[PDB]
Design a protein around this ligand. Structure first.
Ligand code: ATP
Ligand code: ATP
Ligand code: 9VR
Ligand code: 9VR
Ligand code: K
Ligand code: K
Ligand code: K
Ligand code: K
Ligand code: MG
Ligand code: MG
Ligand code: MG
Ligand code: MG
Ligand code: MG
Ligand code: MG
Lengths: 267, 267
């Protein structure tokens, strides 16, 4: 007998990349579902008995150690930000990226990226700290998105940046290379362009964009009081997890009540 | 000469608990400000040279290790949640706590607490994991608040909870005692009551409420599919930091562009 779309969808929820099971081999749905439920319960029990760390939390901690050890100051800045930051970032209020903003009340929004808060920290810290200024942040960011296998509306960004000396393309590429080598992720760099920053160095794993990176200065700097060379890159943590664990859909990696470390919680 | 309110406010921004300086000794504002600016620049330079970890991030990591090591599963659940969770939690839509909710779009809000997402995880995990189920989450929560020295609109909650065996008042108190002993924070337990959960065991450091804790079952359980004994407690991380560092105002501990590890970034 043949599987309905609802049945295939249920088996896909329970399937994991490490499995090799044919869903349409002719084996009945009831046996495929029971087999996968048993494998997933075993996987979750082993997590609970032996590791207990959340993939997103653990990856944030690993990345934090990497950057702290390399001289970058760990920032934790507001997630709920003034709506005025959007227009000030060059997100023209009828850009499709402008349509991606979650508004809160009348004058606030959920940050769609970490850059503006980090630009404010670079400016303020440069009055107190020796050259170069090196900072980074990891945390939640928010964008309205069309349904896709590589986009979440609530995701987790890493942005590291440096201002002052050493803010060259070669140093930016070297940091990205050291970082992704530390995580074991192969990549290439390709040129792209975006509305906020202009030309970017996009960090690609196959056709998947892991990061956009920028070498300043750029015209936007004046609007933020940035008056020195700078470099920076933003990475999505859920995309890194998707690569590391071979997930078919980024939802496996997200903050979710529906998956724990890529395992369905609907068991 | 005498200091204006604006001048005193500026010196208070630059003052730290470890200082002992009289602001109104007669020394001119210019010298008090220069002295404090020099101390704070030194403090920030030492952080940058030697530690580099954010107080909120570091405390989250320390708490995470404590609970993971004691058998609790680390959860990271959505911050942007359905507005329907508010009414379902017994937050009657004309309660003053209901007026504290940040709404997003028409059907979402920023979570004001971690409990609903954790209740969903307890229910789902109980179908797969052995008794007892032990989980915790640390992350941002959001409430509209009147200006006060102990409240932030964007704060960080820890909630740990357990369901099944061992869900007694004595075990809940023992976990709280082990936890606060680990952090070096003295406390007492006093009874209180709240609208969502009913009677609480409030964890007090002097007059400062560090946590509300609850021993279930409670009537709300049925609305969430919870059908076993449970215990749980919610703690504000910024309040823990305020105690640890003797901050006069909780803003020193918050996500902020205005303070880094309690040091003014306006230098
Ligand atoms: N909606 C999203 N969900 C998950 N990760 C995201 C999302 N948007 C951006 N990221 C991650 O943040 C990084 C930096 O953000 P950036 O603004 O460059 O994204 P982007 O160019 O809009 O990505 P895409 O072109 O894939 O939409 C991206 O390279 C990606 O890893
Ligand atoms: N606005 C806030 N800012 C900082 N921490 C908070 C805030 N609201 C709650 N917390 C922390 O979260 C814990 C659990 O939340 P709970 O709902 O019990 O707070 P609460 O009883 O409303 O606190 P309070 O009575 O001080 O307003 C509190 O004990 C406190 O440590
Ligand atoms: N999410 C991103 C990833 C690139 C990040 C690059 N920025 C960065 O690393 O932070 C340092 C920095 C410096 C200057 C600015 C800025 C402004 F505030 F306007 F944004 N121009 N002045 C901002 C951030 C993207 O959409 O490509
Ligand atoms: N912030 C809090 C701090 C007390 C937390 C206690 N809860 C907890 O630890 O999580 C476990 C849990 C179990 C059952 C429920 C629930 C519901 F979903 F409705 F909320 N009743 N079913 C919810 C959480 C407070 O305002 O007192
Ligand atoms: K496979
Ligand atoms: K690599
Ligand atoms: K003092
Ligand atoms: K104690
Ligand atoms: Mg995009
Ligand atoms: Mg892109
Ligand atoms: Mg990009
Ligand atoms: Mg309150
Ligand atoms: Mg209270
Ligand atoms: Mg309370």
């Amino acid at each position: 007998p043949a599987l309905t779309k609802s049945q295939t969808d249920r088996l896909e929820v329970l399937l994991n990349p490490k499995d090799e099971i044919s869903l349409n081999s002719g084996k009945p749905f009831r046996e495929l579902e029971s087999e996968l439920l048993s494998r997933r319960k075993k996987d979750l029990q082993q997590i609970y008995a032996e590791e207990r760390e959340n993939y997103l939390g653990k990856l944030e901690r690993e990345i934090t150690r990497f950057f702290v050890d390399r001289g970058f100051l760990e920032i934790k800045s507001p997630i709920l930000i003034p709506l005025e930051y959007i227009e000030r970032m060059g997100i023209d209020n009828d850009t499709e990226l402008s349509k991606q903003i979650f508004r809160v009340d009348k004058n606030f929004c959920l940050r769609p990226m970490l850059a503006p808060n980090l630009a404010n920290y670079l400016r303020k810290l440069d009055r107190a700290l020796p050259d170069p200024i090196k900072i980074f942040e990891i945390g939640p960011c928010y964008r309205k998105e069309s349904d896709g296998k590589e986009h979440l509306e609530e995701f987790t960004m890493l942005n590291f940046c440096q201002m002052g000396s050493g803010c060259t393309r070669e140093n930016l590429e070297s940091i990205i290379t050291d970082f992704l080598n530390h995580l074991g992720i192969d990549f290439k760099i390709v040129g792209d362009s975006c509305m906020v920053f202009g030309d970017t160095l996009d960090v690609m794993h196959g056709d998947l964009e892991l990061s956009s990176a920028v070498v300043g200065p750029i015209p936007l700097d004046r609007e933020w009081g940035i008056d020195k060379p700078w470099i920076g890159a933003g990475f999505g943590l859920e995309r890194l997890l998707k690569v590391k664990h071979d997930f078919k859909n980024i939802k496996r990696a997200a903050r979710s009540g529906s998956y724990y470390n890529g395992i369905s919680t609907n068991l």
